[PDB]
Design a protein around this nucleic acid. Structure first.
Lengths: 99, 88, 66, 70, 117, 271
RNA sequence: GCUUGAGUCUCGUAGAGGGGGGUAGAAUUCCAGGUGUAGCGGUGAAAUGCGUAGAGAUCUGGAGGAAUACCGGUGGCGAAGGCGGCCCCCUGGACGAAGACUGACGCUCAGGUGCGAAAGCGUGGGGAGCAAACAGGAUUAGAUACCCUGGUAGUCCACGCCGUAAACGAUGUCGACUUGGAGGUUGUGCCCUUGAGGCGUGGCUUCCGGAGCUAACGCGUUAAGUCGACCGCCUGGGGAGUA
């Protein structure tokens, strides 16, 4: 079980799709093995540059301690999904608490 | 890279007791486990020369421990090469 | 003086961009440790966090760019 | 870089502040380096030569230029 | 003879020549003037005086358009920019704001080899 | 794995052969075979219409399904087969109901792998999807040019197609020749590239190898008389003429595409 | 037998150490379109070149390839070659703390094996920019050069070969001992963190200097000082690192 921070930006009009998506991925995590520590939804805010002809993406942050398998298939699920414009997964040391 | 789980299971299968960790047959078992794991690693990638230089360092270190163990006491040395699965 | 030695932050994180806005220039370039007095491990961490924040569009690359 | 000249501001003030912006950012030095390819030999030799000049006049500043002439 | 109030001035200054082009804010140009367009050939093309004269000719190139104010973008190094924007209001304008829009690679492409003389 | 052969003969000296050990040694699946008589290049008038064809080994046609119409039902890859009608290997696939079929073999494939076509399936290699469910930048093969047609493009060994753009109903692909072509987004495509990319490195060694591939010798038109070819004639190796086909059409550069109805589908022709 | 050399384990740390896979942004070129028009480019000056078949400028968009501004450092890591966006996967080493454990397991190494910049070679791709060869314009007494405008291999990738460099701190490896100062980088302990502190102790590194050494220049605790172990190498210049 390794700790990973997962930050993605989802589309402006696909901000309405965010919560069940989240639980789907939590069904990917907690249904397989893992544990969600922080799940902090930033919501829509302004990019510094127009990624894909558009500003104002909807940011989601997820800190999660999980094995490598589930996050491999989660990265494959993040890639071919057309709702997210960018995703970033990092291996941190521990799990964190505060915003 | 030989997790502590594996180092403990080696050291309490080859050792005088649990806190004994620097005996030579323990060290030969440790280097054997890491050499086998890296034989896993170099099936792929084929061109990691720096990781190979670390591997060849630990191969030569195991060979010098083995020649010392043969020169010192052959009774546990022949048991070590029968048990640990190597020839020389 | 180095404030990052004062608060003792173990890993600077990109998610706070107020300090990251403080440590870049108005053109968006990272500001050298010669003038901020930042101690060098925090300078490396700070540049790494600034690039990680640029990738996530919490910071610009250049000030101009369309 | 980005300058926005707002209400109640003269002309040459704004022009000098734009020149200050260009000298803060160092855009002309970064264009002047990119006109010709300097080899990595020339880069490292320029770095070392400028550094030895820098500190070799600096330690002369610190103790050699502190004793009187007349 | 189409009218529009405000536009953008682009002063592309190289080391050999300065080109002033006054556009609208949608990028579409209205007319241009160079440091070689009137006289001023060769060594006298690189001087700041040539860039001042280029701004003065692009000032009359938009006499039909009636431009009240314009933001001035500046590109490239060389003896262009400051004399040009100083002559730009001397020919009669209100320069709204100034940008330096010169391209800087992030080590993108290899430059040509250094000259020996 | 390509192997160069030991030079124990000249005809052995210049041979590189490629040997795939994962192929099935034995008789192919007999319900999927039919006979394949040879022509010699002769049409129904009995005359040679394509030169340099004749002879070779007898071979049987393997019915390789190109269409991939069974959707949703998964299928397990049993074994890869040699195919004498193709540049690529084929794969015997076993659907869950019990049907067996022959498909093209993609690059990453093995025994016991699961594949399935359909709109629902996956983005692994071997799965066939219509080209609305495939990301831009992907690598497809066995591309149809009409919906339900079967698959005309990118189906020999090592060959693939990149997806460049999707303009609504149409998908702009980049073919293996460097062309850009628009296809409808309704027609199916299999993911991956076609396997056996080592096919290029065999060098055949000798005249008998080309002779049992079914290829008859090619006489140069300079070596003939002027009644036979426009190049022919001359006392001792004269050419003096522009290079032409045997029927007097200029070769070495002159274009020969006159379709005029399929030009709307072309974006950028081959360079 | 012993623990002092050499190693093993527990805990952390910093790192352009390496291999595989993604991805972002700036820029160059090209293509398509919009505005608009007579110059652009280049130079010491020119011309070749591009341009009224609509360039250069400018904006929207696309496509590619390569390299990763700022940070950036007489900074770091690596045996050396070398390594610079960001993320993930696999993986090597070095260092620090307090302990424990084996108990001389060590040092060096002819032949041997491995790695080894760039250029080059083979096969298969890729090809933006740069660019040997090449062409044209100049300069010139001439100019098969420098300067300009182009431009192919090559540079890039995969897998093999080559095995050389001013591969250089022109300084073999290992160990011992011998005044100081200013720094940098990375651990760590103690005291009141009583305040951006002090007093310590480890590793690596940069400069200046003392004795001593040296032909001198300089080196100087990271020695070219004082010693020990092993290895490689030299014996006037050219012919020749050639036959």
């Amino acid at each position: 079980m390794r700790h990973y921070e997962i930050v993605f930006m989802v589309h402006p009009d696909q901000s309405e799709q965010v919560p069940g998506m989240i639980e789907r991925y939590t069904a990917a995590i907690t249904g397989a093995e893992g544990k969600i520590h922080r799940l902090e939804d930033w919501g829509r805010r302004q990019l510094a540059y127009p990624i894909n002809k558009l500003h104002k993406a909807h940011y989601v942050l997820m800190n999660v301690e999980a094995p490598q398998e589930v996050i491999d298939e989660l990265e494959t699920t993040f890639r071919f999904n057309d709702a997210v414009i960018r995703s970033m997964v990092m291996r941190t040391k521990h799990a964190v608490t505060e915003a | 890279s030989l997790s502590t789980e594996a180092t403990a299971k080696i050291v309490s299968e080859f050792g005088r007791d649990a806190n004994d960790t620097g005996s030579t047959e323990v060290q030969v078992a440790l280097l054997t486990a890491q050499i086998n794991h890296l034989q896993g690693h170099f099936a792929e990638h084929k061109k990691d020369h720096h990781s190979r230089r670390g591997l060849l360092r630990m191969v030569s270190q195991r060979r010098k421990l083995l020649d010392y163990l043969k020169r010192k006491d052959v009774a546990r040395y022949t048991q070590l090469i029968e048990r640990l699965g190597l020839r020389r | 003086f180095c404030r990052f030695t004062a608060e003792g932050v173990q890993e600077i994180d990109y998610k706070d961009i107020a300090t990251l806005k403080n440590y870049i220039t108005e053109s968006g370039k990272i500001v050298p440790s010669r003038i901020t007095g930042t101690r060098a491990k925090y300078q490396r961490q700070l540049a790494r966090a600034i690039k990680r924040a640029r990738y996530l569009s919490l910071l610009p690359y250049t000030d101009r760019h369309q | 870089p980005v300058i926005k000249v707002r209400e109640n501001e003269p002309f040459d003030v704004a022009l000098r502040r734009f020149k200050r912006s260009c000298e803060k950012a160092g855009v002309l030095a970064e264009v002047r380096r990119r006109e010709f390819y300097e080899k990595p030999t020339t880069e490292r030799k320029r770095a070392k030569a400028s550094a030895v000049k820098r500190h070799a006049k600096k330690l002369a500043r610190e103790n050699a230029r502190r004793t009187r002439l007349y | 003879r189409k009218q529009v109030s405000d536009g953008v001035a682009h002063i592309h200054a190289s080391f050999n020549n300065t080109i002033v082009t006054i556009t609208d804010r949608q990028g579409n140009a209205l007319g241009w003037a160079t440091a070689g367009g009137s006289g001023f050939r060769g060594s006298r093309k690189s001087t700041p005086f040539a860039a001042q004269v280029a701004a003065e000719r692009c000032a009359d190139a938009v006499k039909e358009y009636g431009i009240k104010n314009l933001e001035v973008m500046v590109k490239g190094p060389g003896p262009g920019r400051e004399s040009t924007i100083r002559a730009l209001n001397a020919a009669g304008f209100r320069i709204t704001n100034i940008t330096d829009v010169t391209p800087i690679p992030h080590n993108g492409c290899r430059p040509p080899k250094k000259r020996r003389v | 794995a390509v192997v160069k052969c030991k030079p124990t003969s000249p005809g052995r000296r210049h041979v590189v052969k490629v040997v795939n050990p994962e192929l099935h040694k034995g008789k192919p699946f007999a319900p999927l075979l039919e006979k394949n008589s040879k022509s010699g290049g002769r049409n129904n008038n009995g005359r040679i219409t394509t030169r340099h064809i004749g002879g070779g080994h007898k071979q049987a046609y393997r019915i390789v399904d190109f269409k991939r119409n069974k959707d949703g039902i998964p299928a397990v890859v049993e074994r890869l087969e040699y195919d004498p009608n193709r540049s690529a290997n084929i794969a015997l696939v076993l659907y869950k109901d019990g049907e067996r079929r022959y498909i093209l073999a993609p690059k990453g494939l093995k025994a016991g792998d699961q594949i399935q076509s359909g709109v629902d399936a996956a983005i692994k290699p071997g799965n066939t999807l219509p080209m609305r469910n495939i990301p831009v930048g992907s690598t497809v093969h066995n591309v149809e040019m009409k919906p339900g047609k079967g698959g005309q493009l990118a189906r020999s060994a090592g060959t693939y197609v990149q997806i460049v753009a999707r303009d609504g109903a149409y998908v702009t692909l980049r073919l293996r020749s460097g062309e850009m072509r628009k296809v409808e987004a309704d027609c199916r495509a299999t993911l991956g590239e076609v396997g056996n990319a080592e096919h290029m490195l065999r060098v055949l060694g000798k005249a008998g190898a080309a002779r049992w591939r079914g290829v008859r010798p090619t006489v140069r038109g300079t070596a003939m008389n002027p009644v036979d070819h426009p190049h022919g004639g001359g006392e001792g190796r004269n050419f003096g003429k522009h290079p032409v086909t045997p029927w007097g059409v200029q070769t070495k550069g002159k274009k020969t595409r006159s379709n005029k109805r399929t030009d709307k589908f072309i974006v950028r022709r081959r360079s």
